């Protein structure tokens, strides 16, 4: 049996979890009352709580099922390890150890690598395994280059574009985004920004949308520059420069419908298109669609074959 360590950010299970969840996100530094209320307000705006918890489970166990049905070389056992709420990464690794799992494959539910994201996932998983003495953790760093992943997104964009009048397709633009990070990672050649540009390039060559731009979103409450431009600011510039009639947002850095999509895209971005008078489009996120499980199954299996 090979452990499948599936890792993701995590989301509060109950409204009462928001406080400790934000504290964990802030590296154990309690947010102010005013920050807590702002974040609580955003959750209420998207309906109360994020569906990320159930989607993540569906992805993790959909992947496990997908792998075990497609071959009989090994039995995969999925453990869920969350970054900022239980079950934590270290909990999942502990669960594998007590279960006797000797070798595991880990994957992050975000297709691009960065020092701030996947690297932190792998560091904590590998350090937990070290302390316990097992299991051996073979980390997958990124998988945006998976052809089925690029094609999944192209199909979703093409499905939306084919409902845009032909005489307005030329005024349609594809906005490809991911979670922003401190700009300083670009000073040491972090692959994150360039992996995102590669993703947008690969998708653009497979869609009927004639225009596209790369943006970032959800930058944090800090004092340093973050990767820009922000998807809101980019929408304004693009409309002012080209008067686009349709904006299609694909935050390909994310794999599920959660706060950073339901609010930062479906509210904040729609507010900008509403303002300039253009139409807002946001294709469904991967979630646990069969096509996406197939993407993850292909990635994990290729990683196992290379082991
Ligand atoms: C790179 C990256 C991803 C993508 C890769 C991955 O998936 O790992 C990601 C995902 C997510 N980030 C999420 C939520 C939040 N992230 C925050 C804050 C931050 N994220 C950061 C980084 C990332 N985050 C950073 C550097 C900060 C600043 C911390 C600080 O200020 O020191 C804050 C604080 C409040 C605010 O700043 O708005 C919240 C609430 C949720 C869950 C949404 C839900 O609950 O549905 C998801 C999926
Ligand atoms: Fe975050
Ligand atoms: Mg904001």
Residue numbers in the entry: 4 to 310
The authors write:
Coproporphyrin ferrochelatase (CpfC) in the CPD heme biosynthesis pathway incorporates ferrous iron into coproporphyrin III (cpIII) to give coproheme, which is eventually decarboxylated to yield heme b by the coproheme decarboxylase enzyme in the final step of this biosynthetic process (Dailey et al., 2017; Dailey & Gerdes, 2015; Layer, 2021). Understanding structure–function relationships of key enzymes, such as ferrochelatase, is an essential precondition for the design of new inhibitors for antibiotic‐resistant pathogens, like Listeria monocytogenes. LmCpfC crystals in complex with cpIII were soaked with a ferrous iron solution and flash‐vitrified after 2, 3, and 4 min, to obtain snapshots of the enzymatic reaction during iron insertion into the porphyrin macrocycle. We report three crystal structures showing different iron content during metalation in LmCpfC, identifying the presence and defining the extent of the porphyrin distortions during iron insertion.
In the “34% Fe” structure (resolution 2.15 Å) best statistics were obtained with a 34% iron occupancy fitted into the electron density, which is located slightly toward pyrrole ring C and D and now in plane with the substrate. Ring A with the substituent p2 exhibits the highest distortion in the “34% Fe” structure (+12.6°), +9.2° in the cpIII structure and lowered values for the “24% Fe” (+4.8°), and the “68% Fe” (+1.9°) structures; in ring B (p4) the angle is altered the most in the analyzed samples (−13.4°, −10.5°, −11.4°, and −6.7°) as a function of the site occupancy by Fe ions, exhibiting a high degree of distortion compared to the coproheme structure. Since its activation is an indication of a saddling (B2u) deformation, these data suggest the formation of a stable intermediate species, consisting of a distorted porphyrin macrocycle in equilibrium with the substrate (cpIII) and the product (coproheme). These data agree with the observed structures representing fractions of iron in cpIII of "24% Fe", "34% Fe", and "68% Fe", where the structure between 0.3 and 0.4 eq of the metal shows the largest porphyrin distortion. The metalation mechanism includes a porphyrin saddling distortion, which becomes predominant both in the crystal and in solution at iron to cpIII ratios between 0.3 and 0.4. The measured change of angles throughout the ferrous iron insertion process at the site of p7 at pyrrole ring D is also peculiar: the rings in the substrate‐ and product‐bound states overlap well for all structures besides the “24% Fe” structure (−2.1° in the cpIII‐structure, −1.6° in the "68% Fe" structure, and −1.4° in the "34% Fe" structure). The residue points toward p7 in the “24% Fe”, “34% Fe”, and in the coproheme‐complex structures, but points away (5.4 Å) in the “68% Fe” structure.
